[PDB]
Amino acid sequence: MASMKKKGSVVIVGRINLSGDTAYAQQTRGEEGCQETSQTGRDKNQVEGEVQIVSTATQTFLATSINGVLWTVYHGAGTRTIASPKGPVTQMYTNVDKDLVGWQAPQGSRSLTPCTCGSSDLYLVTRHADVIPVRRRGDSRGSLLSPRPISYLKGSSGGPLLCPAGHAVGIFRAAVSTRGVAKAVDFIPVESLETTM
Ligand SMILES: CCc1nc2ccc(OC)cc2nc1O[C@@H]1C[C@H]2C(=O)N[C@]3(C(=O)NS(=O)(=O)C4CC4)C[C@@H]3/C=C/CCCCC[C@H](NC(=O)OC(C)(C)C)C(=O)N2C1
């Protein structure tokens, strides 16, 4: 018992910049600082933007701010706290059935507005700052206009699906794949977030 380890915090290690005319990834913390911040849960780095790149000791993925909550996937974060300037912050939402978790949105983050457009022309934002056109095919499914190998989508779970007007439509959850090629995506609808809240 005395030698039992604690899992570390999720750590924001960068962001996807969507503020201007060009989307691009920025790293804000390197691997050493990340490992150490994971252990302490103390992250004093300034946070900006809607889409964060996050990491544990073992995985890296994305997290998206919507309505004052920083949302990501349970298969990434598990029940982990997130590092903040005042120490580890406990999850405010946890739903393993939806593969969804959430913490209060960090100071300096900006939140996306939930979509009410009723539109099916969507855009997936990846951890490499690619903006991929996606046609909505159901409540939780969208098809890639141009299929990609799953390699291209790996590490982008927790990322947003956006409508043409930049509203959040959903959170990227899983890739629908055949023979290693992603032809569609599964996402957590923003309504399901709104209900979870
Ligand atoms: C309902 C899903 C779910 N839900 C889960 C809910 C709870 C839970 O608890 C541990 C685990 C869950 N795992 C779950 O599924 C796991 C997790 C997840 C997954 O892989 N998600 C992605 C990702 O990038 N993840 S990540 O790298 O960033 C990781 C976080 C660091 C999105 C991108 C995928 C890239 C290609 C990866 C090939 C795997 C194909 C798979 N497809 C498949 O599942 O498709 C369907 C749904 C059509 C069958 C699939 O996508 N996934 C499998």
Ligand SMILES: [Zn+2]
């Ligand atoms: Zn919209």
